[PDB]
Design a protein around this nucleic acid. Structure first.
Ligand SMILES: [Cl-]
Ligand SMILES: [Cl-]
Ligand SMILES: [Cl-]
Ligand SMILES: [Cl-]
Ligand SMILES: [Mn+2]
Ligand SMILES: [Mn+2]
Ligand SMILES: [Mn+2]
Ligand SMILES: [Mn+2]
Ligand SMILES: [Mn+2]
Ligand SMILES: [Mn+2]
Ligand SMILES: [Mn+2]
Ligand SMILES: [Mn+2]
Ligand SMILES: [Mn+2]
Ligand SMILES: [Mn+2]
Ligand SMILES: [Mn+2]
Ligand SMILES: [Mn+2]
Ligand SMILES: [Mn+2]
Ligand SMILES: [Mn+2]
Ligand SMILES: [Rb+]
Ligand SMILES: [Rb+]
Ligand SMILES: [Rb+]
Ligand SMILES: [Rb+]
Ligand SMILES: [Rb+]
Lengths: 99, 99, 79, 104, 99, 87, 106, 99
DNA sequence: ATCAATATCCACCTGCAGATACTACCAAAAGTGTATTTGGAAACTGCTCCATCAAAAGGCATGTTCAGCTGGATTCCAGCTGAACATGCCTTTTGATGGAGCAGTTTCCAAATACACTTTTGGTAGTATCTGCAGGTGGATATTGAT
DNA sequence: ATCAATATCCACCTGCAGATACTACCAAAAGTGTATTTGGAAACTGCTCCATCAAAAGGCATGTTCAGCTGGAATCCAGCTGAACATGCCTTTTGATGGAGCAGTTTCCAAATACACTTTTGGTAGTATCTGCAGGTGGATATTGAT
C-alpha cells in the first residue's frame, strides 16, 4: 500500500501549524480586489493607502478566526465536530450581529 | 418656593408638541415621557460625541453642521440617516435664509 | 471572482487557526457572505471619514477609526 | 423671534446650542450645529411617536405607555438597531415563540 | 377522571401570558434585600433611593429575559426543548461574558 | 433604638417560580432542575458588577445614598443603557 | 527649564505632554496639576506590566526582541490584561494554541 | 529645515525607556512599538473620557487626580486597578513634596 | 508486538532587513516668573425622602404526588468530507516610471467669541378639577383532551 | 366526530391614580446689538507613495478519486420534570414617624487660567555600522499507521 494519514490527522496538524503562526491567510491581491469593489459602491474613484488595506485584512481575519472559534463551540454543543452554516448563524445571532 | 429647588429641565413640552402633530388625539403617560426624555438625551450625546471625535480627528476646533451631519451618517441606520440628514439640512438652509 | 477570490483553502486556513477540525461544504459560501457584511460595515464607515476629510484616499486612520466605532479596536496602524 | 421658529422647528435650538457648549465637545460650536441637531432629534422623536401611537391604537388605547414605545422600536428594524443596546423600562418583549415548541 | 392539561400546554399558556405583559417578575422586597446585601459587602452604611432599586430590577430582569432567549436558542440547537446549565454557559461564552 | 439585622442568603429570594416566570417571558418551555441555581449565580455576578460601579459613582460624589443616576451611569458604562429613570 | 515634571514625579512618561493632551482633548474646562501626574504614572505602570510579560514571552520563545506575537501571548495569558483588552485586536498577534478536547485523536 | 516636518509625536521613546528598566537586554520591533503606542493612546482615551463623564455628572469644570483615580477604578480589572492607584498616588506624593 | 513512511526537532550557519548609533538642526513644547480670576470647599441649615415600624390579609411559594414524554443511550449505515495527486493558472515580487493628491504654506474674511443689556420663558409651586383605564363581574365562545 | 372541563373573550362598569387645567411668580435662559478676534477655506504646489506595468518563477489553487468515519435517523426506556393540589407565610399595601443626608446659599482663598519671556527637547533627516533570527542544511528521533 502507499502511505495515507487517517482523516482528521492532517486537519489537527494544520490547526497546530496555524495557531502557532501569525501570518495572514487570505491572499493579498484577491482581498485588495474585494475591498476596492465594496468601497466603489460607496464612493467612486477611490485610492487606498497600502496600510489601510492591511488594517482591513488584519481586522477581517481576526474577526473570522474568532467567529470560527464560536462556531466550533456551537458545533460541539450539538455533539458534532463538523461546523455548519447553522453554527455560524447561532454564533452571530447570540453575538448580536443578527439580533 | 422652598429655598427654590434648582430647575430640572427636560424635552417634555417639545416631545408633547411633536406628539400632538402626529397623533392629535393621543396622550403619553409620565413614565412613557421619561423614556422619551432619556431617548433624546441619549441620541444627543451619541451624535455630539461622534461630532466631537470627528472634529478632533481632523484637527478642527469647531463643531459645525457638517460634523453633526457626518455623525448622523455614522450613527443612524439607512433610512433614518437619509431622512434625518434631509431634515437637518432643510432646517439649516431655512435658518440662514432669514435676515 | 472577487468575493469568490476568497478561496476554499483560505477559508479553511482561517477555520484551522480558529481550531476547526471538520468543515461542511456549505461553510465556504456562508463565510463569504459574512466577510462581505463585515467589510461593507467597516468600509462604509471608513469611506465616510474619507469624505468628511475631503480626501480621495482612504487612510489607515480612516479604517482604524471605523473599527474603533464598530467596537473592533485595532492596534498597530496609528502612525 | 426664536432660533427655532426661524429654523422651522419645534425642538429648542437655543437649549441645544447651550448643551453643546456645556458638554465640552469642542472649543467652538458653529451656529448651524444646534439647528441641524435639534432637527435630527425632533425628526427621530416624531418617528418613534408615530409608531408608538399606532401601537397604542392597535391595543385600543389613547395614552402611549412604555409598552407602546417598546413595541414601536422592536417592531421597526431601524429603531431596533439604533436602540440595540438600550432597555426600555416597563416595555417587556415581543410575543415570540420558537416553532419547535408548538405542539402538533 | 379529573381534567389534566398535557405537559407543555400550561408552559405555552404561561409564555403567552408573560410575553403580553410588562410587570416585573421577581418579588420586590426579596430583590431589594439581595441588592442591599451585595452592596453592603462592597461598602457599609449605604442607603438607596427607591428608584435606584427599581432601576436595578428593571435592568436585571431584562438582562435575565434576554439571556433565557439566547439559552433557549442554544437548547434548540442541540435538538432539545429543555434549557440546561450548559446552554447558559454557551450563551454567555459567545456573548463575551465568559471567555 | 437602632436596627439593621444581618443580611444573608438573600440570593434564595430569587425563587424557582420567579425564575420560571422570567424564562417564560424569554420564550422557554421546559427547564432543567439545575437551571435555578445556575441563574442565581449569573444574577449575582450581574448585580455585583452593576452595584460595584454604581457605588463607585456614589463614593466619588461623597454621598451615602445610591441614586437612580448612579445606577443609570453604571448600567450605561457596562453597555446596558437603561431608559426611564433619569438622565 | 529647571526640573521636568516627570523627574519631579519619579516618572519616565511625559507629565507635560499628558497635561497638554488632557487640555486639547476637551475633557473638561479645567485640569488640575496632579491629574496629568497621576495619569502618566498609571500609563507608565501598565506599559511596564505588558513589556514585563511580553519580554518573558520572548524569553520562552528563545528571543531577545519583543514582536507583536509576544504582546499577544502576554495579554491573552494574563486574565486581567486580556479583560482590559477584550475588544482589542493586536495586529500580527495570531491566537493561543488551543484545541478542544473532543477533537483530539481517539 | 521645518517644512514636511509636521511633528508626528508618539510614546515610543518613553515606552523604550520603560522596556530597559524591566528587560535591559530585550529590544522591541517597530510593529510591536506601534502596538504599544496604540495601547498607551487607547488607555489614555478611556481613562480621560471616564474622568470627563465623572466631572460632568458631578457638575465640576475640573478633572483632578481624584477623577483620574475613580476612572481607573471603574476601568481596570481588580488587581490591575489596585496597583495603578498605588502608582498614581505615589507619583502625586513624590511630585508635591518636590521643590 | 514489528517496522516503514513521514513529520518534526535541534544544532549549526549565514545574509540581510531592520534595528542602532552618531551628528545637525529647529519648531514647538515645555518650564519659569508675574498678574488675575474663580471653582468649589466650609460652614450653616432647610426640607426631602429613606429606613423603620404597625398591622391586616390574601397572593403566591413550598412541598408533595403522579405519570407523560423528553433526553440520553445504542445502533446502524449512506454519503460527505478529508487526504492525496496531477496539473496549470494566477499571485507574488520587484524594479521602475508617471502622476494623483496629501500635505505644507501663505492669505484673508465670514463667522466665531466676548460682552452688555433687555426681554422672554420653562420650570416650579400651589390649588382644584376631569378622565383613561385597571380590575371586577358575569356570561358567551374557544381550546384542549378523554373517548 | 362528540362531549365536557376549563381557559379565554368581551362587554360592561366604576373607582381613582394619574393626567390635566389655572394662576402666579421668577431666575435662568434667550435674544439683540456691537466691538474684536480668528478658524479654516481658498489657491498654489512640492514630494510622497499610490496604481500600473512588465515578467519570470512557482506556489498554490482547482479538479478528481476513493473511502473512512461522521451525522443523523430510528428505537427504546428510565426517570426528570410539568401539572395539580393542599397549606399557610411573608410579601404587599396602607399609613405614620423621626431624622439622616442631600442640596441651597453665601463666604472666601488655594489653585487655575492667562501672558510673557527663556530654555529645552523630541522629532526629523542624513550618513554609517551593527545584529537577531529567518530560512536553509543535515541528521537524529518521534509519530503515525500498516501489519
Ligand atoms: Cl446548516
Ligand atoms: Cl455651523
Ligand atoms: Cl448542563
Ligand atoms: Cl489635581
Ligand atoms: Mn455581608
Ligand atoms: Mn465662584
Ligand atoms: Mn408553606
Ligand atoms: Mn413510566
Ligand atoms: Mn426524544
Ligand atoms: Mn460506505
Ligand atoms: Mn495635482
Ligand atoms: Mn410659560
Ligand atoms: Mn381590563
Ligand atoms: Mn489663523
Ligand atoms: Mn456519530
Ligand atoms: Mn443632619
Ligand atoms: Mn534630543
Ligand atoms: Mn529557523
Ligand atoms: Rb449609519
Ligand atoms: Rb473594575
Ligand atoms: Rb522529532
Ligand atoms: Rb374564547
Ligand atoms: Rb501618494
Amino acid at each position: 500500500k502507499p502511505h495515507r494519514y487517517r482523516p482528521g490527522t492532517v486537519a489537527l496538524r494544520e490547526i497546530r501549524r496555524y495557531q502557532k503562526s501569525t501570518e495572514l491567510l487570505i491572499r493579498k491581491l484577491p482581498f485588495q480586489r474585494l475591498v476596492r469593489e465594496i468601497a466603489q459602491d460607496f464612493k467612486t474613484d477611490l485610492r487606498f493607502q497600502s496600510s489601510a488595506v492591511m488594517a482591513l485584512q488584519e481586522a477581517s481575519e481576526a474577526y473570522l478566526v474568532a467567529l470560527f472559534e464560536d462556531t466550533n463551540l456551537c458545533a460541539i454543543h450539538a455533539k458534532r465536530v463538523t461546523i455548519m452554516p447553522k453554527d455560524i448563524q447561532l454564533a452571530r445571532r447570540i453575538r448580536g450581529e443578527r439580533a | 418656593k422652598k429655598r427654590r429647588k434648582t430647575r430640572k429641565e427636560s424635552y417634555a413640552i417639545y416631545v408633547y408638541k411633536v406628539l400632538k402633530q402626529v397623533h392629535p388625539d393621543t396622550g403619553i403617560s409620565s413614565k412613557a415621557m421619561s423614556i422619551m426624555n432619556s431617548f433624546v438625551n441619549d441620541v444627543f450625546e451619541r451624535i455630539a460625541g461622534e461630532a466631537s471625535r470627528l472634529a478632533h480627528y481632523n484637527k478642527r476646533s469647531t463643531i459645525t453642521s457638517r460634523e453633526i451631519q457626518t455623525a448622523v451618517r455614522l450613527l443612524l441606520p439607512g433610512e433614518l440617516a437619509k431622512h434625518a440628514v434631509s431634515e437637518g439640512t432643510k432646517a439649516v438652509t431655512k435658518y440662514t435664509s432669514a435676515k | 471572482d472577487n468575493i469568490q477570490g476568497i478561496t476554499k483553502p483560505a477559508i479553511r486556513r482561517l477555520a484551522r487557526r480558529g481550531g476547526v477540525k471538520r468543515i461542511s461544504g456549505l461553510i465556504y459560501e456562508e463565510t463569504r457572505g459574512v466577510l462581505k457584511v463585515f467589510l461593507e460595515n467597516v468600509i462604509r464607515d471608513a469611506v465616510t471619514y474619507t469624505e468628511h476629510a475631503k480626501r480621495k484616499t482612504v487612510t489607515a486612520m480612516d479604517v482604524v477609526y471605523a473599527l474603533k466605532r464598530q467596537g473592533r479596536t485595532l492596534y498597530g496602524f496609528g502612525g | 423671534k426664536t432660533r427655532s421658529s426661524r429654523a422651522g422647528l419645534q425642538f429648542p435650538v437655543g437649549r441645544v446650542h447651550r448643551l453643546l457648549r456645556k458638554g465640552n465637545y469642542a472649543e467652538r460650536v458653529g451656529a448651524g450645529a444646534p439647528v441641524y441637531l435639534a432637527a435630527v432629534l425632533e425628526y427621530l422623536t416624531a418617528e418613534i411617536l408615530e409608531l408608538a401611537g399606532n401601537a397604542a391604537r392597535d391595543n385600543k388605547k389613547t395614552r402611549i405607555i412604555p409598552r407602546h414605545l417598546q413595541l414601536a422600536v422592536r417592531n421597526d428594524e431601524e429603531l431596533n438597531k439604533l436602540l440595540g443596546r438600550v432597555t426600555i423600562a416597563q416595555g417587556g418583549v415581543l410575543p415570540n415563540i420558537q416553532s419547535v415548541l408548538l405542539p402538533k
